Amino acid sequence: MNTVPFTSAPIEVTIGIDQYSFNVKENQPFHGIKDIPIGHVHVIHFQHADNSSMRYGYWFDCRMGNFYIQYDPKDGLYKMMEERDGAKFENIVHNFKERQMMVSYPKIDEDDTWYNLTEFVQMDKIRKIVRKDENQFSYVDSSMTTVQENELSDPAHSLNYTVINFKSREAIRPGHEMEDFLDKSYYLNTVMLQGIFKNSSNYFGELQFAFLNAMFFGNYGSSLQWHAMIELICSSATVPKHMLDKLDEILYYQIKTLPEQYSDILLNERVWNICLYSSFQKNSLHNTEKIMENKYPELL
Amino acid sequence: GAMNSSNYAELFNNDIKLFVDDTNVYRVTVHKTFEGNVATKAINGCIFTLNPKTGHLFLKIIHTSVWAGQKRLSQLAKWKTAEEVSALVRSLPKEEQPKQIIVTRKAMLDPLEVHMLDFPNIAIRPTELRLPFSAAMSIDKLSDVVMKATEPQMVLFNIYDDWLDRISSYTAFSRLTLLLRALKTNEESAKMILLSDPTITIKSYHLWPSFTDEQWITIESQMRDLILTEYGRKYNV
Numbered sequence: 001m002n003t004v005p006f007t008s009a010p011i012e013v014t015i016g017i018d019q020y021s022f023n024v025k026e027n028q029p030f031h032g033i034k035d036i037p038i039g040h041v042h043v044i045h046f047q048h049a050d051n052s053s054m055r056y057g058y059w060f061d062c063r064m065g066n067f068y069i070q071y072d073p074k075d076g077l078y079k080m081m082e083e084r085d086g087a088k089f090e091n092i093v094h095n096f097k098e099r100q101m102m103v104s105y106p107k108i109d110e111d112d113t114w115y116n117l118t119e120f121v122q123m124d125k126i127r128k129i130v131r132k133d134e135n136q137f138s139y140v141d142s143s144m145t146t147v148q149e150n151e152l153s154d155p156a157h158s159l160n161y162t163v164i165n166f167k168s169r170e171a172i173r174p175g176h177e178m179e180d181f182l183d184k185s186y187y188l189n190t191v192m193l194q195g196i197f198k199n200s201s202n203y204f205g206e207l208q209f210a211f212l213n214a215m216f217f218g219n220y221g222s223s224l225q226w227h228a229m230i231e232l233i234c235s236s237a238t239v240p241k242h243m244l245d246k247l248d249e250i251l252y253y254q255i256k257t258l259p260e261q262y263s264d265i266l267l268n269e270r271v272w273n274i275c276l277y278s279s280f281q282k283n284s285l286h287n288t289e290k291i292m293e294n295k296y297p298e299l300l
Numbered sequence: 301g302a303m304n305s306s307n308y309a310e311l312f313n314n315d316i317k318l319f320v321d322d323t324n325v326y327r328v329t330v331h332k333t334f335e336g337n338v339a340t341k342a343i344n345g346c347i348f349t350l351n352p353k354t355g356h357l358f359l360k361i362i363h364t365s366v367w368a369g370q371k372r373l374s375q376l377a378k379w380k381t382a383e384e385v386s387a388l389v390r391s392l393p394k395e396e397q398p399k400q401i402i403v404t405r406k407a408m409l410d411p412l413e414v415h416m417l418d419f420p421n422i423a424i425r426p427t428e429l430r431l432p433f434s435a436a437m438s439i440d441k442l443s444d445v446v447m448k449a450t451e452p453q454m455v456l457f458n459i460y461d462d463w464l465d466r467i468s469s470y471t472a473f474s475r476l477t478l479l480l481r482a483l484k485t486n487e488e489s490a491k492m493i494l495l496s497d498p499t500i501t502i503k504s505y506h507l508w509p510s511f512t513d514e515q516w517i518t519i520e521s522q523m524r525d526l527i528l529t530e531y532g533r534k535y536n537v
């Protein structure tokens with residue numbers, strides 16, 4: 001059970017940790033989150049009371065370092081930092097727990113929501129999408145654009161998701177124009193799975209990470225990327241049977257976790273109506289189709 | 301973007317462009333089976349690819365053999381059209397390739413876009429205009445060459461005949477679309493008009509009769525009357 005201590009909380013802020021959130025008042029005596037489950041990536045994120053503009057946060061894995069949060073009054077945000085001195089960190093954390101100044105990650109026994117949303121998400125892959133190699137943790141916010149977005153302006157602050165474009169030469173074999181456009185199996189299985197991602201777990205991990213950045217930060221380019229990777233599978237006539245069953249499970253939990261009041265912006269009508277009712281795989285997403293109908297029959 | 305009434309003069313500027321109409325690519329004769337069901341039999345079709353400035357027509361004849369053993373022919377027809385248009389562009393010298401291709405039906409956009417990925421600087425555009433190109437098969441000589449074909453075959457025509465010796469492209473296109481709109485709305489009467497006077501003939505190397513300037517005015521007027529009428533007969537006005 002690892003800990004992310006906070007130096008202090010000088011400005012009033014809504015703090016989020018995975019799928020949970022709580023409010024901290026200006027200068028409230030608050031010194032972090034303890035009991036964070038080991039074995040998963042995590043995300044700790046922020047929304048200032050005074051300026052709901054910019055949600056931002058940090059992806060991290062406690063097995064890769066001791067990390068803490070410290071507000072920066074110059075740049076105006078809560079910054080993640082690594083402490084290299086191990087006995088300094090334990091001593092700081094131990095003091096804050098003795099004084100019960102830390103809230104507890106409320107990992108309710110029965111609950112596997114977080115695991116199911118981050119099953120294939122690895123810190124090593126996150127850090128190739130979010131390039132900032134002097135740090136073991138990765139910063140993301142609402143406004144960061146994707147590589148594919150910047151093609152259509154600062155490359156350092158970009159999200160390097162894998163570019164998917166259904167009307168591109170990468171996607172379309174010369175002489176197989178119609179075949180490859182109406183059945184994307186070549187592009188999924190040969191170009192992306194065998195060629196770029198190497199296996200379905202790496203593909204699923206980027207899908208999952210894109211959705212979480214869309215949900216937690218309202219990152220529009222991440223939502224584009226999540227939808228694209230769903231559509232490429234649903235529009236391939238040939239998909240490995242294990243990928244189809246896993247995808248149903250993956251999407252089900254994303255739809256289950258989505259705030260109801262955010263569905264109007266985070267869900268693309270066309271992609272879902274095609275995936276659920278028109279595509280090759282229209283019959284392979286029973287769990288996801290069931291929850292989309294009980295819960296969002298309007299969009300459909 | 302899309303081509304419409306507002307930007308209609310772009311057609312006659314000096315940027316090469318082509319209209320592509322696919323209406324007549326897949327043609328059938330729905331009929332009854334001995335068992336009382338309905339079956340289609342295909343007949344030969346064509347792609348109508350037209351340079352509106354010069355009147356050059358690239359008439360690709362689609363032979364019925366193209367469809368043999370194929371499924372979902374209405375959808376194949378659009379990809380077959382796009383394959384043939386991209387092959388035509390590739391065959392042309394670079395300085396003859398269009399800078400824009402305007403499709404007359406929006407369902408050709410994606411097929412053509414995909415077959416033209418190799419030509420990123422050629423813009424593929426829909427139009428808001430309801431152009432009467434489907435009626436190209438009411439032109440006797442075009443219909444004749446399509447129906448006689450026994451193999452795939454490209455035939456080149458000038459759809460303006462020699463009109464550009466006397467009138468501008470803008471006026472030539474307007475005459476063509478009026479003539480074709482008339483044939484589309486009442487083919488019988490449109491043809492009666494064009495051929496009534498046995499003294500007016502069609503040159504062996506032309507598609508339309510040899511009309512004087514004055515006679516073209518009279519013809520155009522008669523074509524207008526027919527279009528409004530049928531608009532009356534169709535709407536009761």
Ligand SMILES: Cc1ccc(OC[C@H](O)CN)c(C)c1
Binds near residue numbers: 021022023033104105
């Ligand atoms: C780590 C952590 C997670 C959730 C929390 O409470 C959420 C509660 O419902 C108030 N919105 C707290 C206080 C801490």
